Amino acid sequence: SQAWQPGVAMPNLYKMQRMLLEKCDLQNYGDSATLPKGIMMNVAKYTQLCQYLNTLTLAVPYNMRVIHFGAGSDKGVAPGTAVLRQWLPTGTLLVDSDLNDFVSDADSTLIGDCATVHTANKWDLIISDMYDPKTKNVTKENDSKEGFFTYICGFIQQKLALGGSVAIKITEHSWNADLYKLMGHFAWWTAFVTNVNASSSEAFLIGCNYLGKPREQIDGYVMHANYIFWRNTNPIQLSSYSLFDMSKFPLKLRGTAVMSLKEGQINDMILSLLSKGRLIIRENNRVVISSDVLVNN
Amino acid sequence: AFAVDAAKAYKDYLASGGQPITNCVKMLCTHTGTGQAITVTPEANMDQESFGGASCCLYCRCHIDHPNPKGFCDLKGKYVQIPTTCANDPVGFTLKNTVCTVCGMWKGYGCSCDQLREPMLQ
Ligand SMILES: Nc1ncnc2c1ncn2[C@@H]1O[C@H](CSCC[C@H](N)C(=O)O)[C@@H](O)[C@H]1O
Ligand code: NA
Ligand SMILES: [Zn+2]
Ligand SMILES: [Zn+2]
């Protein structure tokens, strides 16, 4: 039934439970979806993520600004970035970044730790596929991780335009309590599992329409335990079916209004427009980005 | 005057029997597109495969300057349509082929600007 969907979003009732953390043990762990001929797993994964994002109230202004973290692959190319550029309207600005060098279709690419990335502007959409290789090779008590996740939390709170959205990749071991707490700063949020990678604990934490303040207090340690409980009790069938119908794939250019309102002008009417994906609040100054360079002999 | 010629070096490498550059990013699409060579979005028809442009550019992939004063790339940030019979070597195809400046189709693989004037159709 869910097999023809691009994936499965965590039902809302899980967000209201208080589950104890334990191992994520997937029943469909030893399966694989039928990937279309010559299609890389990451092209399939991002295609399903974008197919799901099309069903949400994303703000899509003219001159949209998108930043993609963890865009490089061991292949030296950017499969996810190519899918995002295919999905996003033609006039959308796309910047990507990764610790390792790679060739990209993005307007600009920054190489180095995301912690070295700076920008004077606000963004309308943040996509992260960052994952630390040590998380895999080294297993230990499953506590909140504080490497690139601390940067992402700070980037959301200072560089995301109100009304903007995020899609941050997490796994059983690659997660952060502060990031779950920030999901409460969006009009709505969920954990989305792509059907092509349902055999993995991977999921995208999606924050839809940033409000700049908490609409709900979320305990990150409890919410990750709730996420694992959902993955352990509701098996997701591996499926690549949604990849064969790309007729309605492009993100519709809504032409969402962009206004440079002050923090004292954010009333209940504004929060209501932000919550419907009908408003983006940020200045529209020249987009400037940079990557710090450590200098030493 | 010395100048590295990566284009002829890749052609000679293929002529010898060298494996073509891999990991060109193939995109999912309807295969009901215009069939033009380089487009802002995948435009493959039933006889083509669409790929992310930067991954099919010899200069982008080898991390070397582009052969033109401005150092501009015609593939990066766009999608390149490659005939299915040549999709095993997209970098080689973009090198050895030219886009018609009139119809936007590849010369010898879509461009019909040189065919006879079809007895006019009502
Ligand atoms: N602190 C950090 N800053 C930047 N990139 C990081 C990072 N920690 C991990 N990464 C990157 O996260 C990536 C995870 S794999 C990403 C795959 C890519 N999205 C695709 O489309 O195929 C790796 O390339 C790794 O270098
Ligand atoms: Na597009
Ligand atoms: Zn190039
Ligand atoms: Zn022509």
Author numbering:
A (entry chain A): 6800 to 7096
B (entry chain B): 4271 to 4392
Sentences copied from the publication:
To facilitate structure-based drug design, we conducted an X-ray crystallographic study of the SARS-CoV-2 nsp16-nsp10 2′-O-methyltransferase complex, which methylates Cap-0 viral mRNAs to improve viral protein translation and to avoid host immune detection. Nsp16 is a 7-methylguanine-triphosphate-adenosine (m7GpppA)-specific, SAM-dependent 2′-O-MTase that is activated upon binding to nsp10 (16, 19). However, the main known function of nsp10 is the stabilization of the SAM binding pockets of nsp16 and nsp14 (19). The 2’-O-methylation of coronavirus RNA that is mediated by the nsp16-nsp10 heterodimer is essential for preventing recognition by the host to evade immune responses that are triggered by viral mRNAs.
The structures of the heterodimer were determined in complex with the methyl donor SAM, the product of the reaction (S-adenosylhomocysteine, SAH), and pan-methyltransferase inhibitor sinefungin (SFG). The nsp16 protein catalyzes the transfer of the methyl group from SAM to the Cap-0, generating the reaction products SAH and Cap-1. Notably, SAH and SFG interact with the same residues as SAM without modifications in the site or the overall structure. The high resolution of the structures with bound SAM, SAH, and SFG could facilitate the computational design of small molecules that have higher affinity than SAM for the SAM-binding cleft and have specificity for SARS-CoV-2 nsp16 compared to host methyltransferases. Thus, the heterodimer is the most soluble and stable form of the 2-O-MTase complex, and the dimer of dimers in the large unit cell formed as a result of crystal packing.
